[PDB]
């Protein structure tokens, strides 16, 4: 068995010796190798060093070729042999990468064997133009109540997850990946969504714990993890968002739908700033190069919703940006805000108070908006958005309002229930029917008698009663696609029956 | 107007070499100016005191051109190489007199069409090895070509043959071949 | 799961053991007559690549 596999790997790995156009390393240092030779080499062509490291031909000069090393530059010495790969920089793509953890070059790192991909795709492909795109009209279900109602994400949208450190940015992104299991297990392939998680500059232990979480929840079957951790070279962390984007662009161009998370692009900008400063390029704002905007703009513009003449596929991007002391006016976050289609802002102050996810409702924007959410969610979240705005205006009167009007007290009481409604535990994403029912109960006044400290327990028990005793209500909602006034009266009665049965 | 060199040589030292090549090929002194430059370079290597004297930036350029002129009359250099070294000492460019000569040697090697071949073997061999290696290397030649063969010995490649050409290279050696096979063993399953 | 992990652990140590055994056996088995035969094959392969043009 093992001997047969070992024998067929020896026989299958034929050397195929032939003369290759080669170069010679002149000087190596600061992640840049200057190579003498390679007359017929192309710009941005991948090379092979004698130690096995890959590199990208960045600068073509009359006398030398500047090569960006995809690895540690201690493996390259002056006078080494640099061979042309003959191809511009590309990574393996396909459905053979699902369930596999790879580095920025596409090589597996989880030890599960090689990757049997038959296709490769360039990492520097330009984004689709005006014509092949179409409007974003299919929902992206993150499973988060506060996201899917107030900052609704569509398929083909770029939604920024921005905040300070340890505010739940990875928690939102991972729960969005886990939530797609209910759609991937179903037979409806148009709602199926593949996932690509790109870890840039993170800790390798953190990536391993993420892969364990995806494996336990069975979310790894449709997920590709591209890992360029903090121990990896800056060119590897620079390349990894484009490598993962190419793997996600395989699904976009083949009629399927993919979600990609760049966690985080602020660390990729640091890696690119390191490469730019070691190339003597003129620093700008916060020592960043001038093309650090084009670094993220050429990446995120490849996340698009394609027209029916292009297969109808899509790529959805969730870039992550870490701020410093909640400063969204800094250079790098302002660049990504000008690129993406809206941002989800996470507050440190809300995170300290126990509000998780600590989403700032007033500072979270979805430029697509209601155009990419279901009728039932849009009809209810429109009312909740108005009521949260009303609660926000009168929140200043709660500080000293010992005596307050009945209308203002109702607005304060409703806003407290709605704020407690949006709280959600980690690694427990919710189906869209469960989200609609819970938000509908809190927005119609059913929770005005329920204490805010018992809303989460009411959320489990009342949904269980609906899922067991009143399944005909859900069937009517699923058939109609919205909430009828007849169903509104029925939901009023079963809420009154449920609260009376719990206590009287 | 300058005559195009057979190959492109880069740097300021290559600019002087292409200027000297173009001037020598507009006239009929290509072989003459190559002969005295090689003999000058051999004279500088055989007498390191001359090389230290020319490269000394303290000495005035009049002493340099007198020393250059005194050692170039014995070379029977007539017009081009004398003006070439006078131009090198007129500027502060005679510090790399070895650089321009080496660049000029590179131009003239491609003028004759010679292609450098580097063949590395674990142990030296002749007779049967050298006869077939010459014919095998001659098969890469386009018409109007010559072979400059350099043989090397290195026990780090176990055995096999590491043969290189002016821009092409192969690694058909035992050490690299078992290395990728062992890499295939570790990455098998 | 216990039998699968036991099989995987035994497979991994057997793969490691056979790798170092093969490396040591290949390195210790060097003969000059085979080395000359491989040298002749390398020259013939180099001559074949020169013809292939």
């Amino acid at each position: 068995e093992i001997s047969a596999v070992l024998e067929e790997k020896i026989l299958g790995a034929a050397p195929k010796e032939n003369l290759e156009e080669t170069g010679r390393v002149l000087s190596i240092g600061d992640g840049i190798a200057r190579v003498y030779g390679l007359k017929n080499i192309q710009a941005e062509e991948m090379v092979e060093f004698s130690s096995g490291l890959k590199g990208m031909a960045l600068n073509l000069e009359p006398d030398n070729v500047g090569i960006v090393v995809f690895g540690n530059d201690k493996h390259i010495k002056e006078g080494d042999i640099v061979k042309r790969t003959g191809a511009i920089v590309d990574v393996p793509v396909g459905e053979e990468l699902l369930g596999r953890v790879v580095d920025a070059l596409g090589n597996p790192i989880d030890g599960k064997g090689p990757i049997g991909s038959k296709t490769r795709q360039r990492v520097g492909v330009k984004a689709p133009g005006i014509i092949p795109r179409v409007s974003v009209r299919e929902p992206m279900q993150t499973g988060m109540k506060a996201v899917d109602s107030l900052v609704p994400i569509g398929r083909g949208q770029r939604e920024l997850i921005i905040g300070d450190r340890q505010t739940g940015k990875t928690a939102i992104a991972i729960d969005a990946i886990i939530n797609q299991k209910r759609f991937n297990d179903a037979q409806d392939e148009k709602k199926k969504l593949y996932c690509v998680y790109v870890a840039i500059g993170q800790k390798r232990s953190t990536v391993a714990q993420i892969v364990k979480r995806l494996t336990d929840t069975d979310a790894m079957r449709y997920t590709i993890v591209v890992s360029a951790t903090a121990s990896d070279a800056a060119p590897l962390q620079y390349l990894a968002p484009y490598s993962g984007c190419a793997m996600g662009e395989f699904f976009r161009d083949n009629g399927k739908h993919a979600l990609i998370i760049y966690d985080d692009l602020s660390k990729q900008a640091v890696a690119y700033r390191q490469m730019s400063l070691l190339l003597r390029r003129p620093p700008g704002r916060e020592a960043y190069p001038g093309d650090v905007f084009y670094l993220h703009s050429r990446l995120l513009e490849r996340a698009a919703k394609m027209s029916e003449s292009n297969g109808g596929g899509s790529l959805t991007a969730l870039p992550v940006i870490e701020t410093q002391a909640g400063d969204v006016s800094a250079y790098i976050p302002t660049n990504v805000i000008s690129i993406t289609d809206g941002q989800i802002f996470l507050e440190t102050e809300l995170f300290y108070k126990g509000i998780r996810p600590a989403i700032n409702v007033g500072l979270s924007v979805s430029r697509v908006g209601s155009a990419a959410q279901t009728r039932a969610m849009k009809q209810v979240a429109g009312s909740m958005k108005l009521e949260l705005a009303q609660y926000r205006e009168v929140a200043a009167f709660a500080q000293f309002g010992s005596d307050l009007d009945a209308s203002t007290q109702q607005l304060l009481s409703r806003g407290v229930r709605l704020t407690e409604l949006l709280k959600q535990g980690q690694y427990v994403p919710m189906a869209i029917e469960d989200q609609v029912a819970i938000i509908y109960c809190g927005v119609r006044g059913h929770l005005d008698k329920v204490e805010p400290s018992k809303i989460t327990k009411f959320e489990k028990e009342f949904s269980q009663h609906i899922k067991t005793s009143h399944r005909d209500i859900l069937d009517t909602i699923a058939k109609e696609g919205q909430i009828s006034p007849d169903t509104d009266a029925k939901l009023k009665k079963v809420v009154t029956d449920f609260l009376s049965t719990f206590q009287a | 107007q300058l005559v195009k060199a057979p190959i492109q040589v880069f740097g300021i030292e290559g600019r002087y070499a292409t200027a000297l090549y173009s001037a020598a090929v507009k006239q009929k002194k290509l072989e003459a100016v190559e002969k005295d430059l090689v003999q000058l370079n051999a004279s500088l290597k055989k007498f390191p005191r001359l090389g230290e004297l020319l490269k000394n930036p303290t000495l005035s350029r009049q002493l340099k051109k007198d020393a250059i002129g005194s050692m170039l009359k014995e070379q029977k250099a007539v017009d081009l190489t004398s003006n070439f070294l006078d131009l090198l000492t007129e500027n502060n460019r005679l510090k790399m007199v070895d650089g321009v000569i080496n660049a000029f040697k590179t131009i003239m090697a491609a003028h004759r069409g010679e292609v450098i071949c580097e063949v590395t073997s674990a142990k030296p061999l002749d007779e049967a090895a050298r006869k077939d290696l010459e014919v095998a290397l001659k098969g890469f030649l386009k018409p109007g070509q010559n072979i400059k063969l350099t043989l090397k010995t290195d026990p780090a490649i176990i055995g096999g043959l590491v043969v290189s050409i002016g821009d092409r290279f192969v690694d058909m050696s035992i050490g690299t071949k078992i290395k990728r096979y062992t890499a295939a063993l570790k990455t098998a399953v | 799961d216990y039998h699968l992990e036991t099989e995987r652990a035994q497979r991994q140590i057997k793969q490691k053991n056979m790798v170092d055994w093969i490396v040591r056996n290949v390195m210790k088995s060097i003969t000059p007559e085979q080395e000359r035969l491989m040298l002749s094959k390398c020259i013939s392969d180099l001559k074949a690549m020169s013809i292939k043009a």
Binding site: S3, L6, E7, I10, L11, A14, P15 | I174, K177, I178, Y181 | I13, K14, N17, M18, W21, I22, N25, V26, S29, Q34, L37, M38, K41
Partner: peptide, 28 residues
Amino acid sequence: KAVDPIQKLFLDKIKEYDQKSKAAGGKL
């Protein structure tokens, strides 16, 4: 259609390992 002699040597070392391992009752 001549095979690589190193590949043949590697196959012989695999067969030699397999014969010695089966003669050792599966032990290392």
